């Protein structure tokens with residue numbers, strides 16, 4: 001009914017003696033002794049030349065009408081699972097990217113109604129194809145003919161109200177497209193949620209493109225090839241090393257504030273004592289929150305991770321990709337500047353001294369925290385992306401941000417148990433930070449911030 | 458270079474013309490010219506129109522104010538290029554618009570024509586206002602596509618193999634589309650100068666990034682106060698979903714303040730536990746757990762917020778802007794005094810509310826959690842965390858969703874530590890299908906959606922000595 005059907009590229013088709021197996025990651029379909037007409041039709045689906053009506057004829061022609069009716073019936077189950085692509089050749093191919101899949105071809109009325117390309121639709125290069133995608137679609141459209149890119153260019157260039165009945169004459173003149181191809185193309189674009197039929201929205205207005213795209217893509221064995229580039233702790237930045245104090249955790253296991261007290265007492269504190277936080281306090285704080293407790297090689301892993309660490313917080317895949325850079329404006333036995341915390345040696349390493357660039361990071365934290373007392377220490381959290389990205393496809397960055405939160409709450413509770421003044425910070429300029437430190441922004445970048453000062457009695 | 462392209466003022470720039478002064482104005486910078494001479498004024502007007510070259514603009518100034526004034530004009534104009542005030546165009550094809558200060562366009566060496574190149578994987582086309590725009594998180598420019606023939610060129614570039622060499626492949630582009638070789642060379646020079654092309658066709662530590670991750674990172678890691686206009690639509694707690702309400706137990710927190718596990722013990726003992734006891738977690742345990750982690754402790758109106766937030770709550774975890782946009786849906790496969798199904802936790806009344814009973818759809822959410830935690834024991838309870846986006850999006854521009862995800866983490870660690878103090882079996886779950894969940898519950902995915910998951914069962918006691 002209107003499109004050429006074909007199998008998803010994600011689908012694999014193991015053909016053998018006696019059996020035919022159709023296979024995705026999720027689902028498996030075995031056909032034992034499939035009849036010639038059905039086999040012929042399954043081959044033409046792999047080619048992609050044909051309509052449902054034509055595929056049904058192939059089955060019936062050899063296996064009879066009941067077999068063909070069964071085939072069409074059972075084939076729409078596979079459409080639901082996202083196994084069937086719909087194409088308008090030679091222009092475009094819709095590929096499902098989700099289960100529970102459906103294409104409602106719209107009413108003829110669309111031709112006289114004002115429409116527009118969705119503000120969430122975008123074109124980009126996927127592998128060796130141009131693809132049209134949207135966080136609002138269950139499909140990605142592979143652009144086969146460059147003349148489709150010309151059509152989208154004109155749609156985006158049009159005014160708010162593009163009406164196909166009055167504006168299609170331009171598209172058909174300059175580009176050598178027939179009216180029936182162009183009508184089928186628009187029907188697919190509407191069916192795959194790339195078009196707006198109401199130019200107005202209601203609770204979709206509130207979303208920004210980059211947020212909805214990220215949410216969509218993250219809410220659906222690999223080898224650690226670059227293990228030597230992204231080791232379990234970062235290679236030392238500076239030859240200067242300031243050793244930090246180590247508290248007696250066995251003593252604290254019985255002496256420390258209770259978990260219930262820590263949770264119920266926890267506040268964000270932005271006003272500080274005149275006496276800055278001490279180096280001894282910073283040292284105890286970091287040991288309790290972020291140290292390397294052990295180093296182990298997992299004896300089995302086929303992913304070839306090599307060495308990994310255990311730390312005082314949980315972390316997706318283990319791996320522990322975050323680093324901590326204490327930016328010191330005021331501290332006990334510490335000159336002002338940017339440091340890097342080294343969690344295995346339990347040491348600080350100077351990264352940069354107090355310049356105008358480093359001061360503006362402290363100003364941003366101060367401004368972000370309501371201008372309610374000059375920061376003493378700001379902990380800038382960074383992520384070494386290569387430590388995690390190899391393992392996680394689309395969810396790596398969403399894991400990282402949940403790790404920042406995991407760390408924030410750990411900082412909050414330990415700070416509360418030490419009578420320090422904690423506050424998370426929502427924003428920060430990563431390009432400014434990457435420039436101050438030595439960092440390639442693609443390799444490592446700030447993803448979180450946390451202010452820490454001495455609290456008043 | 459300013460000679461290879463035609464010049465215009467950024468659309469973000471505004472030009473207040475008055476009897477004796479001329480003011481050029483962005484959000485950041487302000488330039489006042491007192492008694493500017495006719496030739497300079499004429500040239501500044503044509504920059505606002507666009508479509509003239511540096512050479513032509515210099516002629517306009519010189520024609521009326523003399524050659525020295527024109528030389529001065531061209532010299533001083535490259536200061537404005539640095540501030541992001543000047544667009545560079547290859548008419549009638551494309552116009553590069555700066556989106557950042559400290560702006561520079563290094564037109565590449567002729568060598569690019571014989572070198573293998575490719576469109577950046579981070580370059581993307583989308584509809585901005587009434588134009589098609591090419592953008593990248595790796596660029597300081599956005600290119601407005603003026604001619605559809607540029608979209609055809611990009612379509613072919615993306616369709617090409619790893620190694621597209623202009624010297625050997627440009628013949629196709631020039632044949633089918635009516636473009637001249639000099640237009641096409643200028644276009645490619647601009648695309649290279651604005652970071653839309655790769656000259657090392659292989660990358661190094663940029664390969665590892667997926668488009669949606671790099672875009673989100675760049676936009677979230679970069680004025681009058683906003684108003685909470687839809688406060689009534691997004692109140693401090695969600696309106697009750699079901700009439701059935703199962704009340705939950707409330708522990709003595711004053712007693713726990715002294716009797717509970719220490720914070721150090723909780724942190725040092727915390728483990729992810731995926732294997733469970735035969736006895737499922739009880740309703741009394743679930744109730745104590747949620748009270749300690751996620752209840753509304755107080756309701757207050759802030760007496761002088763100008764943002765008109767109205768009522769807000771305090772809870773056992775911190776939250777960006779306060780506001781507390783998250784909800785918790787306990788999905789119960791096995792529990793003490795609770796039939797299997799999906800519930801919603803109500804943090805002010807401290808009650809559970811049935812959302813959906815045990816269907817094949819609800820079972821597949823439990824299967825996904827089981828599969829995600831290694832298939833190491835059937836889940837007992839899975840806590841699905843959701844976000845009511847309108848509670849937060851009004852206040853935060855580009856960072857709202859990154860705050861939400863940090864809140865999920867904040868909650869995960871709170872769940873982990875309390876579970877550890879209660880001797881329960883906790884584990885965070887990295888992924889989950891929001892569409893499937895939104896369908897099972899009653900939810901519009903644009904209004905509210907799952908953003909986190911956490912499994913919780915009864916732990917074994919067990920030994921090792």
Ligand SMILES: Cc1cc2nc3c(=O)[nH]c(=O)nc-3n(C[C@H](O)[C@H](O)[C@H](O)COP(=O)(O)O)c2cc1C
Pocket residue numbers: 313314315316317318399402403406727728729730829830831869884885886887888
């Ligand atoms: C954000 C986040 C997501 C996680 N996702 C999963 C998951 O999908 N599956 C799983 O088995 N464990 C998950 N975990 C638990 C980690 O795998 C665990 O912290 C680590 O592998 C081992 O540390 P632990 O045993 O000290 O918790 C997650 C943890 C965090 C912080």
Ligand SMILES: Cc1cc2nc3c(=O)[nH]c(=O)nc-3n(C[C@H](O)[C@H](O)[C@H](O)COP(=O)(O)O)c2cc1C
Pocket residue numbers: 266267268269368369370408423424425426427774775776777778779860863864867
């Ligand atoms: C992810 C996150 C980001 C935050 N960002 C900021 C911030 O930018 N500025 C600020 O003053 N407080 C920030 N906070 C602290 C909250 O404002 C605070 O938790 C809440 O306003 C008051 O609750 P509390 O005093 O119990 O923490 C943040 C908290 C979290 C969890």
